[PDB]
Design a protein around this motif. Structure first.
Motif, mmCIF file in Angstrom:
data_model
loop_
_atom_site.group_PDB
_atom_site.id
_atom_site.type_symbol
_atom_site.label_atom_id
_atom_site.label_comp_id
_atom_site.label_asym_id
_atom_site.label_seq_id
_atom_site.Cartn_x
_atom_site.Cartn_y
_atom_site.Cartn_z
ATOM 1 N N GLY A 182 31.372 64.810 52.120
ATOM 2 C CA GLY A 182 32.297 65.183 53.174
ATOM 3 C C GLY A 182 33.136 64.033 53.695
ATOM 4 O O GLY A 182 34.210 64.250 54.254
ATOM 5 N N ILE A 183 32.650 62.807 53.516
ATOM 6 C CA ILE A 183 33.376 61.627 53.976
ATOM 7 C C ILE A 183 34.796 61.642 53.416
ATOM 8 O O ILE A 183 34.994 61.691 52.203
ATOM 9 C CB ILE A 183 32.667 60.330 53.536
ATOM 10 N N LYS A 184 35.777 61.597 54.311
ATOM 11 C CA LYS A 184 37.182 61.631 53.918
ATOM 12 C C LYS A 184 37.739 60.305 53.411
ATOM 13 O O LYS A 184 38.523 60.282 52.463
ATOM 14 C CB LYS A 184 38.036 62.121 55.089
ATOM 15 N N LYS A 185 37.340 59.203 54.039
ATOM 16 C CA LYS A 185 37.841 57.895 53.636
ATOM 17 C C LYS A 185 36.785 56.966 53.049
ATOM 18 O O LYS A 185 35.795 56.629 53.702
ATOM 19 C CB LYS A 185 38.517 57.205 54.824
ATOM 20 N N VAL A 186 37.012 56.555 51.805
ATOM 21 C CA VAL A 186 36.112 55.648 51.109
ATOM 22 C C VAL A 186 36.931 54.464 50.609
ATOM 23 O O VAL A 186 37.868 54.634 49.829
ATOM 24 C CB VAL A 186 35.439 56.331 49.900
ATOM 25 N N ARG A 187 36.581 53.268 51.068
ATOM 26 C CA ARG A 187 37.290 52.061 50.667
ATOM 27 C C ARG A 187 36.346 51.054 50.025
ATOM 28 O O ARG A 187 35.130 51.124 50.207
ATOM 29 C CB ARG A 187 37.989 51.436 51.876
ATOM 30 N N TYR A 188 36.916 50.118 49.276
ATOM 31 C CA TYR A 188 36.138 49.101 48.581
ATOM 32 C C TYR A 188 36.260 47.705 49.180
ATOM 33 O O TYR A 188 37.251 47.368 49.827
ATOM 34 C CB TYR A 188 36.562 49.040 47.110
ATOM 35 N N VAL A 189 35.229 46.902 48.947
ATOM 36 C CA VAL A 189 35.182 45.522 49.406
ATOM 37 C C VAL A 189 34.505 44.721 48.304
ATOM 38 O O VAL A 189 33.300 44.843 48.087
ATOM 39 C CB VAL A 189 34.376 45.375 50.714
ATOM 40 N N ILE A 190 35.289 43.915 47.599
ATOM 41 C CA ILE A 190 34.762 43.103 46.511
ATOM 42 C C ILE A 190 34.104 41.852 47.076
ATOM 43 O O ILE A 190 34.763 41.015 47.694
ATOM 44 C CB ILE A 190 35.884 42.693 45.533
ATOM 45 N N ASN A 191 32.798 41.734 46.863
ATOM 46 C CA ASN A 191 32.027 40.600 47.359
ATOM 47 C C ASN A 191 31.668 39.638 46.228
ATOM 48 O O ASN A 191 31.616 40.027 45.060
ATOM 49 C CB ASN A 191 30.743 41.106 48.026
ATOM 50 N N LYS A 192 31.427 38.381 46.587
ATOM 51 C CA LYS A 192 31.049 37.347 45.628
ATOM 52 C C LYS A 192 32.060 37.081 44.512
ATOM 53 O O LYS A 192 31.675 36.879 43.360
ATOM 54 C CB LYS A 192 29.694 37.690 45.003
ATOM 55 N N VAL A 193 33.347 37.076 44.846
ATOM 56 C CA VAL A 193 34.377 36.811 43.847
ATOM 57 C C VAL A 193 34.463 35.305 43.615
ATOM 58 O O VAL A 193 34.943 34.561 44.470
ATOM 59 C CB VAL A 193 35.752 37.333 44.302
ATOM 60 N N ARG A 194 33.994 34.865 42.450
ATOM 61 C CA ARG A 194 33.990 33.448 42.107
ATOM 62 C C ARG A 194 35.261 32.934 41.439
ATOM 63 O O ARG A 194 35.662 31.793 41.665
ATOM 64 C CB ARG A 194 32.796 33.135 41.202
ATOM 65 N N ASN A 195 35.895 33.763 40.615
ATOM 66 C CA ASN A 195 37.098 33.326 39.916
ATOM 67 C C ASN A 195 38.249 34.328 39.863
ATOM 68 O O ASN A 195 38.089 35.508 40.181
ATOM 69 C CB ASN A 195 36.739 32.900 38.491
ATOM 70 N N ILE A 196 39.410 33.830 39.445
ATOM 71 C CA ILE A 196 40.623 34.630 39.325
ATOM 72 C C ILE A 196 40.486 35.697 38.241
ATOM 73 O O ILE A 196 41.057 36.782 38.352
ATOM 74 C CB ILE A 196 41.839 33.731 38.993
ATOM 75 N N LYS A 197 39.731 35.383 37.195
ATOM 76 C CA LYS A 197 39.520 36.322 36.099
ATOM 77 C C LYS A 197 38.849 37.582 36.636
ATOM 78 O O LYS A 197 39.148 38.693 36.199
ATOM 79 C CB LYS A 197 38.641 35.684 35.020
ATOM 80 N N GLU A 198 37.941 37.396 37.589
ATOM 81 C CA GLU A 198 37.232 38.511 38.202
ATOM 82 C C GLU A 198 38.184 39.346 39.050
ATOM 83 O O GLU A 198 38.037 40.563 39.149
ATOM 84 C CB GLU A 198 36.082 37.992 39.067
ATOM 85 N N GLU A 199 39.161 38.684 39.663
ATOM 86 C CA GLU A 199 40.136 39.378 40.494
ATOM 87 C C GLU A 199 40.980 40.306 39.631
ATOM 88 O O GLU A 199 41.212 41.459 39.988
ATOM 89 C CB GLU A 199 41.040 38.373 41.213
ATOM 90 N N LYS A 200 41.433 39.797 38.488
ATOM 91 C CA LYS A 200 42.244 40.589 37.572
ATOM 92 C C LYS A 200 41.459 41.809 37.105
ATOM 93 O O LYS A 200 42.024 42.885 36.916
ATOM 94 C CB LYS A 200 42.662 39.744 36.366
ATOM 95 N N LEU A 201 40.155 41.633 36.924
ATOM 96 C CA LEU A 201 39.286 42.721 36.491
ATOM 97 C C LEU A 201 39.238 43.818 37.553
ATOM 98 O O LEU A 201 39.096 45.000 37.235
ATOM 99 C CB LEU A 201 37.872 42.195 36.229
ATOM 100 N N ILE A 202 39.352 43.416 38.816
ATOM 101 C CA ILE A 202 39.324 44.358 39.929
ATOM 102 C C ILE A 202 40.623 45.153 39.991
ATOM 103 O O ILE A 202 40.609 46.382 40.055
ATOM 104 C CB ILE A 202 39.125 43.623 41.275
ATOM 105 N N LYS A 203 41.745 44.441 39.973
ATOM 106 C CA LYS A 203 43.058 45.072 40.024
ATOM 107 C C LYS A 203 43.299 45.910 38.772
ATOM 108 O O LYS A 203 44.360 46.514 38.613
ATOM 109 C CB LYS A 203 44.146 44.003 40.147
ATOM 110 N N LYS A 204 42.305 45.945 37.892
ATOM 111 C CA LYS A 204 42.401 46.699 36.649
ATOM 112 C C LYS A 204 41.682 48.044 36.722
ATOM 113 O O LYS A 204 42.193 49.054 36.238
ATOM 114 C CB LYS A 204 41.825 45.874 35.494
#
Length: 254
Positions: A182-204
């Motif tokens: 039933g929850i209407k709003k679900v958002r994400y929070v990326i924790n423990k991001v060590r590198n830029i490569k991991e960021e690109k993986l997220i935006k993917k």
């Protein structure tokens, strides 16, 4: 403001909820910090020492209270009234934050732990439906404490994950369990991001609109004896991102 923080990462993930609570403490006159994660300790991550935390008896351990609220002698009270007694099921960590520990839900036996489960369910129901004060409940990926009845009161379900396919799956699932609940709003929070490569993986694998924010990893700002009490000051970048994440949150709800 009713918030739920779900993730599968123990203390690490709970640190997000803890961080949001500390920041929200400056805007709200009172916040119900609910530790609903059995594989973690919101209390300690919030600054409480091992002893101070344990001094706060969890709902599951309030035998006498459970007996009085759910009944006894083979008779179960279908609709328990506890909304007015919530402030007695915990302690004020400080002048703003009030911590309530749920306690691990006994699964083994499969017999009938209805009484205990009923007491906990009633408390969660009152916190989300009968209380006006802000609520931030930390919980596991299963989010079993929430029901369709309390899901309607949830302002936002924040899924905390790590920048890796394994955690991305867990997140997508949390979004499902919450969505179907039933929850209407679900958002994400990326924790423990060590590198830029991991960021690109997220935006993917995740849309920018669903991502509330990112929290960089700190090997010298999360471990040792410089974490917990020492953080009120704007030091590590993780602090700056936490605020931005909070602002993003307030903008979503408001």
């Amino acid at each position: 403001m009713k918030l739920a923080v779900a993730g599968k990462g123990g203390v690490g993930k709970t640190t997000v909820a803890a961080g949001l609570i500390k920041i929200m403490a400056s805007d709200y006159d009172k916040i119900y910090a609910v530790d609903g994660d059995p594989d973690s300790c919101l209390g300690q991550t919030l600054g409480l020492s091992i002893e101070e935390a344990y001094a706060i008896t969890p709902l599951i351990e309030m035998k006498d209270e459970i007996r009085e609220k759910t009944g006894d002698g083979g008779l179960l009270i279908l609709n328990p009234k506890v909304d007015g007694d919530l402030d007695k099921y915990g302690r004020y960590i400080d002048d703003k934050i009030f911590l309530i520990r749920m306690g691990e839900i006994k699964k083994g036996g499969s017999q009938c732990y209805c009484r205990e489960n009923s007491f906990l369910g009633s408390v969660v129901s009152a916190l989300f439906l009968d209380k006006k004060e802000a609520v931030v409940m930390d919980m596991g990926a299963g989010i079993e404490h929430l029901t369709r009845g309390t899901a309607k009161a949830v302002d936002m379900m924040i899924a905390v994950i790590e920048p890796n396919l394994n955690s991305i799956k867990t997140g997508l699932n949390i979004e499902k369990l919450a969505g179907d609940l039933g929850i209407k709003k679900v958002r994400y929070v990326i924790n423990k991001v060590r590198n830029i490569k991991e960021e690109k993986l997220i935006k993917k694998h995740l849309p920018e609109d669903k991502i509330l924010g990112i929290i960089p990893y700190n090997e010298l700002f999360i471990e040792l004896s410089l974490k917990g009490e020492e953080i009120w000051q704007s030091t590590n970048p993780a602090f700056v991102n936490l605020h931005d994440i909070y602002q993003k949150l307030r903008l979503e709800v408001g």
